[PDB]
Amino acid sequence: QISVRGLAGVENVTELKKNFNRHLHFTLVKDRNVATPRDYYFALAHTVRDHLVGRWIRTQQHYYEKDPKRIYYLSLEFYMGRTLQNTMVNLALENACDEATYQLGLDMEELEEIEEDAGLGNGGLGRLAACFLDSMATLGLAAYGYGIRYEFGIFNQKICGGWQMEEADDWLRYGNPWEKARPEFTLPVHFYGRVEHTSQGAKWVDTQVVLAMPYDTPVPGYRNNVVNTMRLWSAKAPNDFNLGYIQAVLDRNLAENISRVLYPNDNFFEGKELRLKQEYFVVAATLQDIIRRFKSSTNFDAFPDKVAIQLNDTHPSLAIPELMRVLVDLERLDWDKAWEVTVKTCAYTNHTVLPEALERWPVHLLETLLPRHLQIIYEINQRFLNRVAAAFPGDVDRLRRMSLVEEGAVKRINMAHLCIAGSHAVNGVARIHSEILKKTIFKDFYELEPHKFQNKTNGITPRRWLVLCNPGLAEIIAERIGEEYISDLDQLRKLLSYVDDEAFIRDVAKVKQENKLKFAAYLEREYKVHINPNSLFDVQVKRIHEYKRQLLNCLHVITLYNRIKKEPNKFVVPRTVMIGGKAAPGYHMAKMIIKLITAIGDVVNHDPVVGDRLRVIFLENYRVSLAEKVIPAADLSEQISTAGTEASGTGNMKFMLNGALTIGTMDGANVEMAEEAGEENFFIFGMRVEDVDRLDQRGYNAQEYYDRIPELRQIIEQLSSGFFSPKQPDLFKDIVNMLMHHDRFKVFADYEEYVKCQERVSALYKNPREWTRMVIRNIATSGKFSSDRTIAQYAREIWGVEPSRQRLPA
Amino acid sequence: QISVRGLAGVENVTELKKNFNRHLHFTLVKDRNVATPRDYYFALAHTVRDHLVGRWIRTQQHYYEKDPKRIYYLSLEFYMGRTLQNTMVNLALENACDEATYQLGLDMEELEEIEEDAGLGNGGLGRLAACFLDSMATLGLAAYGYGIRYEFGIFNQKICGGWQMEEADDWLRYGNPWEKARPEFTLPVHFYGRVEHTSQGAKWVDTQVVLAMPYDTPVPGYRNNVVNTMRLWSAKAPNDFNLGYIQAVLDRNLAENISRVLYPNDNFFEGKELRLKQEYFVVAATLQDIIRRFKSSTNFDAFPDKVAIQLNDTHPSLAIPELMRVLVDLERLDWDKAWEVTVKTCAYTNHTVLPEALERWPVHLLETLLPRHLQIIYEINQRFLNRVAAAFPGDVDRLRRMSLVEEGAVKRINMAHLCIAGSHAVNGVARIHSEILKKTIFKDFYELEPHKFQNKTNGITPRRWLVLCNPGLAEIIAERIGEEYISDLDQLRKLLSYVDDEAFIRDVAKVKQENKLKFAAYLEREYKVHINPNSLFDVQVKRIHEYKRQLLNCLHVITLYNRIKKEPNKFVVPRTVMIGGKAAPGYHMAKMIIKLITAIGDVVNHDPVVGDRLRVIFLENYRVSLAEKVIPAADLSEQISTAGTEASGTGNMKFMLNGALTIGTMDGANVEMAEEAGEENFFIFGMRVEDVDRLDQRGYNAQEYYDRIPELRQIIEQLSSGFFSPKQPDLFKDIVNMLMHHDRFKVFADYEEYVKCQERVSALYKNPREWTRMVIRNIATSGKFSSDRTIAQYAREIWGVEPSRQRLPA
Numbered sequence A, B: 001q002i003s004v005r006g007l008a009g010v011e012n013v014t015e016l017k018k019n020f021n022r023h024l025h026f027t028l029v030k031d032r033n034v035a036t037p038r039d040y041y042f043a044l045a046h047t048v049r050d051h052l053v054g055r056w057i058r059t060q061q062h063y064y065e066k067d068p069k070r071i072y073y074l075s076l077e078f079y080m081g082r083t084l085q086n087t088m089v090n091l092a093l094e095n096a097c098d099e100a101t102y103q104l105g106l107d108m109e110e111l112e113e114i115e116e117d118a119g120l121g122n123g124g125l126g127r128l129a130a131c132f133l134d135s136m137a138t139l140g141l142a143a144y145g146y147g148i149r150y151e152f153g154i155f156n157q158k159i160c161g162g163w164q165m166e167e168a169d170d171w172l173r174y175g176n177p178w179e180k181a182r183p184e185f186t187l188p189v190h191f192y193g194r195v196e197h198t199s200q201g202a203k204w205v206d207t208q209v210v211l212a213m214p215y216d217t218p219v220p221g222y223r224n225n226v227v228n229t230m231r232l233w234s235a236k237a238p239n240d241f242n243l244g245y246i247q248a249v250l251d252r253n254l255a256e257n258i259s260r261v262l263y264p265n266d267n268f269f270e271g272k273e274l275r276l277k278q279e280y281f282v283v284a285a286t287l288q289d290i291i292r293r294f295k296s297s298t299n300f301d302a303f304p305d306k307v308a309i310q311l312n313d314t315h316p317s318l319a320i321p322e323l324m325r326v327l328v329d330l331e332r333l334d335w336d337k338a339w340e341v342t343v344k345t346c347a348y349t350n351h352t353v354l355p356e357a358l359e360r361w362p363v364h365l366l367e368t369l370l371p372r373h374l375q376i377i378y379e380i381n382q383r384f385l386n387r388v389a390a391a392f393p394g395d396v397d398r399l400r401r402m403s404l405v406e407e408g409a410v411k412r413i414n415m416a417h418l419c420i421a422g423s424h425a426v427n428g429v430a431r432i433h434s435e436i437l438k439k440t441i442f443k444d445f446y447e448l449e450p451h452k453f454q455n456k457t458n459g460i461t462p463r464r465w466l467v468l469c470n471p472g473l474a475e476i477i478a479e480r481i482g483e484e485y486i487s488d489l490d491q492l493r494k495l496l497s498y499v500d501d502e503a504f505i506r507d508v509a510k511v512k513q514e515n516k517l518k519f520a521a522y523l524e525r526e527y528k529v530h531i532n533p534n535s536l537f538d539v540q541v542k543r544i545h546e547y548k549r550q551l552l553n554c555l556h557v558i559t560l561y562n563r564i565k566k567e568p569n570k571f572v573v574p575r576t577v578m579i580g581g582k583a584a585p586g587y588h589m590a591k592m593i594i595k596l597i598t599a600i601g602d603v604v605n606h607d608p609v610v611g612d613r614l615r616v617i618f619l620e621n622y623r624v625s626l627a628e629k630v631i632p633a634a635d636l637s638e639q640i641s642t643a644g645t646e647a648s649g650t651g652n653m654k655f656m657l658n659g660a661l662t663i664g665t666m667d668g669a670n671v672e673m674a675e676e677a678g679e680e681n682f683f684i685f686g687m688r689v690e691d692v693d694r695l696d697q698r699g700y701n702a703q704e705y706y707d708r709i710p711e712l713r714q715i716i717e718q719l720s721s722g723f724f725s726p727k728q729p730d731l732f733k734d735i736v737n738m739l740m741h742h743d744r745f746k747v748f749a750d751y752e753e754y755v756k757c758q759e760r761v762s763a764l765y766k767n768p769r770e771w772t773r774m775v776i777r778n779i780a781t782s783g784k785f786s787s788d789r790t791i792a793q794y795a796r797e798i799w800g801v802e803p804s805r806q807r808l809p810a
């Protein structure tokens, strides 16, 4: 049907159809009389997956023969979403499969909906890892993602009585066709035990062993015939484990619990032993695998020439002392040489400056679980502090600030300090964030080793986040400028010369309307909710956090409702306000915020005077597959974190690419987005970082805003008095108390500017032609935010390798 | 190479080779450069399994269209062993696959050794279920085996320092190619809760739910194109289970523990709640599946015409009250009608008379776990006892003996009594066993309802137990009498006319020698032990139990050693004495017996004077795949249980079919074997059942034998004084104490006759020609012991269906 989806050749369609039938029969053991819709999905998945294998084998063969430098991306999170459509897109099979299934009397889109998301991440950090894998394959890098194969990913969110309920994401229940178990590479991981010192070095003895069994998932590049590997480890008890008899077998569960479940905390540290075990498990198994591959090329001097390890935050920080442990204790290298190798091998990416998110592990935990690593960390700290003392003689406070060991009630290890000390490169994820790292939390480190500190602004893959989710937009762009932009997103600049093109303006607006109609229809079918598709789609989707300020959005919504109630017969631009995202199960305030949103909806959506002029909808179970649907449908992207709190954001980039305008603070990558698009084409409001700093010096007094803004006082009075909870008058007292007395994120301080800015959004939307022209100016300048750009910068500036867009032979 | 292994057609070999390569590539994601031996096994398994699918789909289609009466074989054990060779045999693919793999440069036998046994059983009862499935498919019956998919089967046995060690049988670790998950037939199973009585019947409420997910395994008939199903249930937690957050996810393990592990007790009852849960789990899921299939044919009068349920011992006895529960509480049938349906549907097979093996569940357990079933059991008991009272007025002791409820310290439910009451047929598993049931333990029941009591003598499948494991023997037989005997084993009688045939005598002896050489070579390679292949192979393989009297075998072994030591320069017929089998982990005496065997070996095998005249070897990890190797190699089959204790035996039949002579008591099926072969062609010794009864009346005094048999006194003195355990003089004191003072199985009473009989065995072995002629007379009369005969009798006399040897079209 549409060009960017590829060719539907006669031979190809015929072959797909027969391979589909072969799989239905031989693989699924069904015929068309008894086959379930799930059977059809699996038949199709198997048919598509067959097309990966030749390329996958030859890619890995090629790496073995050419021996390039290998890149190892270590993450506890890979937020992959669904795989079927992505594989079809990257192999140019989409149109052919659509045709093949159509001829078999099946709707491919319906089949696609059957696939579970691989929800192995919480949000931004995990999705970033996934976009990165796509870009690394597309750029022909010899890259491997390494992580954990969680049996349960991020929980499925159900809303019951306006409250978040969690249920287990049993994503492997029907079997995962996109993985291959690799039992021959099963490896032992050690825990507990004790350290003996012999005549010939330290030895780690009396350990408990858990096996790490790898599962490989293919990562196809975009039409370049490259298929890289994501290798995820699963925990397995050894067979003699605990070996009355029955109990010993049942107790195997204890060891295998390591890979059971993803910790559902977004930007928050929880010092639990099981989490520490997960972090070591991935690191120990991965490093053995890396070393094995390196030896199958004795001389560890060449190790950094053949290996780069990228640490996705501090979660895999134990890679540093683990590498030292293997090099010193097992390979018998001297400390200084091992350390040189380690530093040149490792690089560290920081993802937040929020203090509660930073990993600070109690010493007593590491002492019991990882005694040799603790000793190695102490030694690293001593040698590091000796360097600081020599550089800054007599500066005793600097020594305590820079220490890897934090003193206090319980001694803790600061993992971020460990990462900086043991990495040749430290990067933030947007320009303002990287500057904040140098100026504030890592200032001491920057002064010691300025050359270590870099910026690498985040990006998103235009395959998933344009071609896959928004084929209509991809097509109208390709019609004017060709297909090359899909792997060279900077080419979107060419669209600037179409900003006054009446045909293009109409097509851009038409694609948006179609997307909105489709999404409005999705909402009725799967959720029985009614929305006006001619309204402005105002969306904020992202994890629920105080710093992300869904509450400020709530305040605006109530403002609009109150204004309508006061002047019912005045025209207002109709809006559908959509808010979605999961709250960490233990985060009370975030759970209260969800209840508030639904409570507002309950009042607003049933007020006869309001009509279809204002609707508030909570988008349940926000996840990658839902983002692919809602983002193409959005008109207005809410990116409203307090300045200095959102390191980068990536949801912001997704909306920009898909034709929504942005209302946002100058925070994270919003700054660079406004810079690329021009500030005239962005709805910027609120305090800058400098303004927040000024307010902190004076002391933030929320009462002042309450006293001076009548519209704000009304809202607080409504919340307090039970207007939004008639049968539980004090339900939202915690929210009011927080806003009035202990608001770290200064919700009231940005309220007036936000409401004014929102008025300017409504004004522009009234002029569809000018709305669309500004949209074109956003899409046209979204090129910088391709993860291909980001990865090219990591490659050249950190890993020391050159990207290549050249095809491997098919 | 050999005829019974089938044709290796040009087209077939070519096609197998290309399908093997296709699977290696697409399924296993390997090429020949990196493929592991395990990869090759899997490629072959997939290639063979592809040949099942068409037949499997059309068999099940045929049942749906023809709607025959369906047979449901319920067992907690299906001891399947390996599947690859069995599938090749039954599809006539063995020679073709051998040729195809040979041309690919691979040895198929080596590949076969990679497959894990499906060890989902303990011994005889579980293997019987497996032989039965093979025979039911071969006889074209619409039969389904239903059981539990244990994650861990029978433990792997390791011998360390002469002691049994257990390790987890993680048989699914690499994935099972012989199963297909059927998620669409996932069913809820209920536990705990309470009973409410409403205006319209009882209701079982507030229950905990565990899901039962089925996995289907194909059961191919022998060259008849029939493929039946074995459906095994796996336990899955529902997704809202226990739904701080992390713990709730980890706690899902509790529900899923139901299908985690097989209880490793052979002929012994352990009243553990987890075991009770397993028993209900299989019954509840299976009955829902049966009822679903029956409705997809309201009128439950026709239920027994379309359904037979065979209970493999009392393990699935809860089928009776569960069927009543569904019929009365859910379908709203009156009690009397439901009961009529239940009795006509169910039949019960008893497998032992040993009192410690009988299931007697504490009332308090059933009260908590299954409150509605307990109430139903009470009601069954009341109505049953009312029938007994009417038949035998005033016989108050009969009422207490026949009650389903046993009084005492803890009240218990006798599950065997439940089974008799609720079944239209009760059978024992050999003629003497069935007679013992009528005369002793079920005498009261037999007097009430004599028509219920039947015999069905056990059998073994001649596919696995001749063609598969002993192709050389199968071939020399087929050369004289054709191939028809493989599914009509009575045809073996024709071999009687070859008993004086010099060519056949030589061929029978040659096949045995070859088997012995192969087994002697297996022992060196995989265990580094040296044996004389010209010695008589004296083997006792079966689970370790006091009743099976491995100890009596030990006494003979020591007797032979002592006799050699006394007269070193006297000729004796050389023997290799092989004993193997697992002990239940909690059975102390059985574990001591294993240690004794190895301790004897340690003395005997290292005595220079003995030479290669006597060797004692403990066969480690005895299991189905090991039986397939050792049984063909045996000369002498030890079947030496105390008369009246081994219900049937099936190992005995396996040895008879494979050309070993039997030394045995008149116990179980040994009686019928001697009857078929003629007593002159069997080495019978020892007390008959009547003699044991006489001894019990007088009181068994072991001391009398010790006092009157000098050779026996010497052995006991050696055991006591530490001759077989120099550094732990009293190691075997428990064994001596048991033999002298509390021997339930009268080891000493059969000692003299056993040793004498063994002398007659040695005498015959000295005359190879006469040894072989007696062997021919055993093989020739082994036909009755085909499980095809057994199943034909169940079909005609219990299930009310006719077997058919007719092919389905291919």
Ligand SMILES: OC[C@H]1O[C@@H](NC(=S)N/N=C/c2ccncc2)[C@H](O)[C@@H](O)[C@@H]1O
Residues within 6 Å of the ligand: A049, A050, A052, A053, A175, A176, A177, A178, A179, A180, A181, A217, A218, B026, B027, B028, B029
């Ligand atoms: O079918 C479900 C099972 O599939 C298996 N995959 C096998 S046999 N081949 N895959 C090959 C493959 C080829 C190309 N891209 C991905 C995988 C997985 O090992 C197993 O964990 C999973 O449960």
Ligand SMILES: OC[C@H]1O[C@@H](NC(=S)N/N=C/c2ccncc2)[C@H](O)[C@@H](O)[C@@H]1O
Residues within 6 Å of the ligand: A122, A123, A124, A125, A126, A128, A266, A267, A268, A269, A313, A314, A351, A352, A357, A358, A359, A429, A458, A646, A647, A648, A649, A650, A668
């Ligand atoms: O860079 C990708 C995205 O990462 C997000 N971080 C997330 S999801 N978790 N971090 C968790 C964390 C845990 C422990 N120590 C530091 C951070 C950032 O908040 C976002 O601005 C950014 O766009």
Ligand SMILES: OC[C@H]1O[C@@H](NC(=S)N/N=C/c2ccncc2)[C@H](O)[C@@H](O)[C@@H]1O
Residues within 6 Å of the ligand: A026, A027, A028, A029, B049, B050, B052, B053, B175, B176, B177, B178, B179, B180, B181, B217, B218
């Ligand atoms: O490969 C390992 C996996 O195989 C799967 N089998 C599938 S996809 N088809 N089988 C078809 C089949 C055809 C004929 N005879 C048996 C099975 C099983 O469902 C899964 O439990 C197992 O882990």
Ligand SMILES: OC[C@H]1O[C@@H](NC(=S)N/N=C/c2ccncc2)[C@H](O)[C@@H](O)[C@@H]1O
Residues within 6 Å of the ligand: B122, B123, B124, B125, B126, B128, B266, B267, B268, B269, B313, B314, B351, B352, B357, B358, B359, B429, B458, B646, B647, B648, B649, B650, B668
């Ligand atoms: O019939 C097949 C074989 O079954 C065996 N029984 C075994 S393995 N377990 N029974 C366990 C059991 C448990 C509970 N209540 C009764 C028996 C018999 O011992 C054997 O003679 C016979 O050949």
